[PDB]
Write an enzyme that holds these catalytic residues in place. Structure first.
Site, PDB file in Angstrom:
ATOM      1  N   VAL A  18       2.183 -29.110  31.327  1.00 45.06           N
ATOM      2  CA  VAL A  18       3.708 -28.765  31.407  1.00 45.06           C
ATOM      3  C   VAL A  18       2.737 -26.729  31.610  1.00 45.06           C
ATOM      4  CG1 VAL A  18       4.767 -27.396  29.225  1.00 45.06           C
ATOM      5  CG2 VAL A  18       3.455 -29.010  28.632  1.00 45.06           C
ATOM      6  N   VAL A  19       3.692 -26.777  32.301  1.00 45.33           N
ATOM      7  CA  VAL A  19       4.190 -25.426  33.292  1.00 45.33           C
ATOM      8  C   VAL A  19       4.909 -24.036  32.335  1.00 45.33           C
ATOM      9  CG1 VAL A  19       4.210 -24.288  35.375  1.00 45.33           C
ATOM     10  CG2 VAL A  19       4.404 -26.527  35.484  1.00 45.33           C
ATOM     11  N   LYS A  34      -0.725 -23.891  34.592  1.00 47.53           N
ATOM     12  CA  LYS A  34       0.819 -25.719  34.237  1.00 47.53           C
ATOM     13  C   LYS A  34      -1.046 -26.457  33.332  1.00 47.53           C
ATOM     14  CE  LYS A  34       1.686 -29.213  37.185  1.00 47.53           C
ATOM     15  NZ  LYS A  34       1.756 -30.040  38.688  1.00 47.53           N
ATOM     16  N   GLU A  80       0.940 -19.547  41.658  1.00 48.42           N
ATOM     17  CA  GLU A  80       2.508 -18.680  42.114  1.00 48.42           C
ATOM     18  C   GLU A  80       3.290 -18.628  41.562  1.00 48.42           C
ATOM     19  OE1 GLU A  80       3.991 -17.501  45.913  1.00 48.42           O
ATOM     20  OE2 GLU A  80       2.903 -19.747  46.707  1.00 48.42           O
ATOM     21  N   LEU A  82       7.200 -18.991  41.289  1.00 51.21           N
ATOM     22  CA  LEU A  82       8.627 -18.495  42.574  1.00 51.21           C
ATOM     23  C   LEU A  82      10.360 -18.416  41.345  1.00 51.21           C
ATOM     24  CD1 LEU A  82       6.071 -20.328  44.052  1.00 51.21           C
ATOM     25  CD2 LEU A  82       8.539 -20.191  46.076  1.00 51.21           C
ATOM     26  N   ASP A 126       7.250 -37.337  46.648  1.00 49.44           N
ATOM     27  CA  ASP A 126       7.644 -37.070  45.611  1.00 49.44           C
ATOM     28  C   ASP A 126       8.617 -35.853  45.646  1.00 49.44           C
ATOM     29  OD1 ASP A 126       8.449 -37.585  43.137  1.00 49.44           O
ATOM     30  OD2 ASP A 126       6.971 -36.051  42.306  1.00 49.44           O
ATOM     31  N   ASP A 144       3.940 -29.503  43.634  1.00 51.53           N
ATOM     32  CA  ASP A 144       4.261 -30.490  42.228  1.00 51.53           C
ATOM     33  C   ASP A 144       3.121 -31.658  43.481  1.00 51.53           C
ATOM     34  OD1 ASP A 144       3.021 -32.457  40.339  1.00 51.53           O
ATOM     35  OD2 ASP A 144       5.129 -32.054  39.270  1.00 51.53           O
TER      36      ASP A 144
HETATM   37  N1  LIG Z   1      13.185 -34.325  36.229  1.00 57.00           N
HETATM   38  C1  LIG Z   1      12.265 -34.439  36.092  1.00 57.00           C
HETATM   39  O1  LIG Z   1      11.569 -35.148  36.593  1.00 57.00           O
HETATM   40  C2  LIG Z   1      11.501 -32.658  36.761  1.00 57.00           C
HETATM   41  C3  LIG Z   1      12.607 -31.616  35.592  1.00 57.00           C
HETATM   42  C4  LIG Z   1      11.749 -30.438  35.719  1.00 57.00           C
HETATM   43  C5  LIG Z   1      10.961 -30.333  36.646  1.00 57.00           C
HETATM   44  C6  LIG Z   1      10.176 -28.942  37.043  1.00 57.00           C
HETATM   45  C7  LIG Z   1       8.587 -28.511  36.642  1.00 57.00           C
HETATM   46  C8  LIG Z   1       8.073 -27.371  37.029  1.00 57.00           C
HETATM   47  C9  LIG Z   1       8.909 -26.718  37.686  1.00 57.00           C
HETATM   48  C10 LIG Z   1       8.234 -25.598  38.077  1.00 57.00           C
HETATM   49  C11 LIG Z   1       9.096 -23.941  38.432  1.00 57.00           C
HETATM   50  C12 LIG Z   1       9.424 -23.345  38.812  1.00 57.00           C
HETATM   51  N2  LIG Z   1      10.372 -21.817  38.871  1.00 57.00           N
HETATM   52  C13 LIG Z   1      11.472 -22.246  38.686  1.00 57.00           C
HETATM   53  C14 LIG Z   1      11.171 -21.466  37.507  1.00 57.00           C
HETATM   54  C15 LIG Z   1      11.595 -19.916  36.805  1.00 57.00           C
HETATM   55  C16 LIG Z   1      11.250 -19.644  35.533  1.00 57.00           C
HETATM   56  C17 LIG Z   1      12.219 -20.057  35.124  1.00 57.00           C
HETATM   57  N3  LIG Z   1      12.798 -21.739  35.404  1.00 57.00           N
HETATM   58  C18 LIG Z   1      11.878 -21.949  36.187  1.00 57.00           C
HETATM   59  N4  LIG Z   1       7.707 -22.335  39.373  1.00 57.00           N
HETATM   60  N5  LIG Z   1       6.963 -21.757  39.756  1.00 57.00           N
HETATM   61  C19 LIG Z   1       5.960 -21.867  40.257  1.00 57.00           C
HETATM   62  C20 LIG Z   1       5.562 -22.878  39.498  1.00 57.00           C
HETATM   63 BR1  LIG Z   1       4.093 -24.610  39.580  1.00 57.00          BR
HETATM   64  C21 LIG Z   1       7.049 -23.568  39.396  1.00 57.00           C
HETATM   65  N6  LIG Z   1       7.026 -25.146  39.047  1.00 57.00           N
HETATM   66  C22 LIG Z   1       9.771 -26.695  38.095  1.00 57.00           C
HETATM   67  C23 LIG Z   1      10.802 -27.967  37.612  1.00 57.00           C
HETATM   68  C24 LIG Z   1       9.861 -31.445  37.555  1.00 57.00           C
HETATM   69  C25 LIG Z   1      10.524 -32.743  37.398  1.00 57.00           C
END
Ligand SMILES: NC(=O)c1ccc(-c2ccc(-c3cc(NCc4cccnc4)n4ncc(Br)c4n3)cc2)cc1
Ligand SMILES: [Mg+2]
Lengths: 297, 258
Positions: A18-19, A34, A80, A82, A126, A144
């Site tokens: 979980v992020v 993460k 980091e 984003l 991916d 990812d």
């Molecule tokens: N459908 C799926 O399988 C699915 C859904 C969501 C995600 C997902 C996971 C993490 C993230 C994400 C999003 C952001 N940033 C975007 C964000 C910031 C604040 C609020 N919401 C989104 N970050 N930044 C560093 C990292 Br490491 C990171 N990871 C975005 C999408 C992946 C796969």
């Protein structure tokens, strides 16, 4: 060890764990945490692959792994931060559309990050809008690496399941013994089209549906267009034989250079499909700049 | 992937220096010896054969062990525990279907618990700082195989066999880099089967000549000749199989003529 970090909110769930959005109390830096729980089977292979590969891959278009915090119970990866992911950005851009300089810039940057991955024997496997992250300054970054793997030259047979269906290459769908760097190019090609139209290029709900959608757009492949196709494990002689449609109709807003690049990214034969490295020199990018996203994130 | 073959080769040559274990670490280990390491590696060959693991996985695990023991003193009764966690980590890194933790506990002959193997996994990761994508003899060999005119399966399997033998003996193979050993092994295989030598195109690719490969090639020739008498026999048994074209049954040459 986690004392200097202050969680703000959950961002989402990727391949594993979980992020969370967090703030370094001492430096002021906004990060993404993460969290993996080891409540089993030890450290998951996905975490092992992501950490080792990302510690090698330092690049401005690859999301930076800052630290690894390794408690008895929990494993935290410090990334980091984003501001936005590409999927949510495309949804917010529904009315105005995405400006062509921004699409061009994003594609150029993504091909840079991908060329770096492939030069360092890493397959992402991916690529999809959710895994492509953007900041206010105009940067786009690959994220990812949970489904990523280190490859050899030449390749062996690797995991079959790979790549989310909509962005999955035809050589995977037809069950080729070997796949390589070309699978990542295919996914980017799909994302290129999606940035222009703001809808997925091939949105199938099964493997056979996905193939038939690809065939209706690019023509059903034969031995002329793709030598060895008819001998592939999941090829069927009963496949309908659709004609290749005029490429100006696949993505209508695209200029001559754009269409040329897209066709080379979506080439059936993995050998003929353009590399990320070679795509950087395409005439499409002659006038590329780096503008900020036209919307607040 | 001909667009990246040079970039990858260059990168692997850089990383193999960074991933190189400490050459004289056994001198600094109070309770374990080269001979004990030889027994462990041979046992890992059997585990690899038992679970039908990739040769790459075996090469990776040995690298993890050597790097771990480069900084961590380990008693003889705990050496097999390091080896098991290393092989488990290598399987997680390299295999499509790694054997589960329970299976790794079983093959230790109940010497260790599930808790011990998991705790050791975590410790090996800390010591290696999660840096597991190391270049191997294997990774260089497969690139070198692309320079065959034409491709010869006996040459390929014999080179893999010889490179595998180098893993057993810390003295002298710890002092040679994976790319050098792969060079020695490829020439020795190619000479044994066809009479041919280290090709001109690989001189251009690698920068290595027969002159620069000579010291490793001299040791590897001696390991090859003395292979049937060696205390450890699992690699010779493994390479009798038709999967590897029965190459261990081939006769080593008496002279190399360098
Ligand atoms: N459908 C799926 O399988 C699915 C859904 C969501 C995600 C997902 C996971 C993490 C993230 C994400 C999003 C952001 N940033 C975007 C964000 C910031 C604040 C609020 N919401 C989104 N970050 N930044 C560093 C990292 Br490491 C990171 N990871 C975005 C999408 C992946 C796969
Ligand atoms: Mg000693």
């Amino acid at each position: 060890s986690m004392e200097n970090f202050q969680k703000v909110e959950k961002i989402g769930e990727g391949t594993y764990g979980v992020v969370y959005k967090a703030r370094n109390k001492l430096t002021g830096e906004v990060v993404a945490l993460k969290k993996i729980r080891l409540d089993t089977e030890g450290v998951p292979s996905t975490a092992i692959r992501e950490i080792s590969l990302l510690k090698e891959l330092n690049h401005p278009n690859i999301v930076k792994l800052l630290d690894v915090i390794h408690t008895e119970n929990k494993l935290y990866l410090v990334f980091e931060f984003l501001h936005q992911d590409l999927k949510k950005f495309m949804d917010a851009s529904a009315l105005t559309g995405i400006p062509l300089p921004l699409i061009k810039s994003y594609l150029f940057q993504l091909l840079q990050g991908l060329a770096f991955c492939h030069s360092h024997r890493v397959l992402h496997r991916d690529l999809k809008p959710q895994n492509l992250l953007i900041n206010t300054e105009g940067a786009i970054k690959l994220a990812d690496f949970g489904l990523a793997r280190a490859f050899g030259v030449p390749v062996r047979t690797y995991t079959h399941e790979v790549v989310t269906l909509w962005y999955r290459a035809p050589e995977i769908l037809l069950g080729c013994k070997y796949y390589s760097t070309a699978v990542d190019i295919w996914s980017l090609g799909c994302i290129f089209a999606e940035m222009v139209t703001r809808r997925a290029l091939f949105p199938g709900d099964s493997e056979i549906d996905q193939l038939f959608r690809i065939f209706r757009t690019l023509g059903t492949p034969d031995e002329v267009v793709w030598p060895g196709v008819t001998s592939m494990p999941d090829y069927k002689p009963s496949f309908p034989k659709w004609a290749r449609q005029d490429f100006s109709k696949v993505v209508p807003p695209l200029d001559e250079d754009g269409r040329s690049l897209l066709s080379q990214m979506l080439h059936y034969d993995p050998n003929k499909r353009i590399s990320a490295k070679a795509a950087l020199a395409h005439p499409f990018f002659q006038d590329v700049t780096k503008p900020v996203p036209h919307l607040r994130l | 992937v001909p667009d990246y073959h040079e970039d990858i080769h260059t990168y692997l040559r850089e990383m193999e220096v960074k991933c190189k274990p400490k050459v004289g670490y056994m001198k600094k280990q109070p309770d374990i010896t080269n001979s004990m390491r030889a027994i462990l590696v041979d046992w890992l060959v059997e585990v690899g054969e038992e679970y039908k693991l990739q040769n790459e996985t075996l090469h990776l695990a040995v690298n993890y062990i050597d790097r771990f023991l480069s900084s961590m003193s380990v008693l003889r009764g705990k050496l097999q525990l390091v080896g098991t966690a290393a092989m488990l980590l290598a399987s997680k890194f390299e295999e499509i279907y790694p054997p589960e933790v329970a299976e790794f506990v079983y093959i230790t002959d109940d010497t260790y618990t599930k808790k011990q193997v998991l705790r050791m996994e975590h410790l090996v990761l800390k010591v290696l700082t999660f840096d597991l994508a190391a270049p191997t003899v294997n990774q260089f060999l497969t690139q070198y195989f692309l320079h065959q005119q034409p491709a010869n399966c006996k040459v390929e399997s014999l080179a893999m066999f010889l490179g595998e033998l180098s893993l057993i003996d810390a003295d002298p193979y710890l002092k040679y880099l994976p790319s050098v050993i792969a060079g020695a092994a490829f020439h020795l295989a190619l000479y044994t089967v066809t009479g041919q030598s280290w090709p001109e195109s690989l001189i251009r690719k690698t920068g290595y000549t027969l002159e620069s490969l000579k010291p490793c090639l001299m040791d590897l020739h001696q390991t090859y000749l003395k292979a049937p008498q060696h205390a450890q026999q699992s690699i010779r048994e493994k390479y009798k199989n038709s999967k590897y074209h029965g190459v261990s049954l081939l006769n080593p040459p008496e002279t190399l003529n360098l």
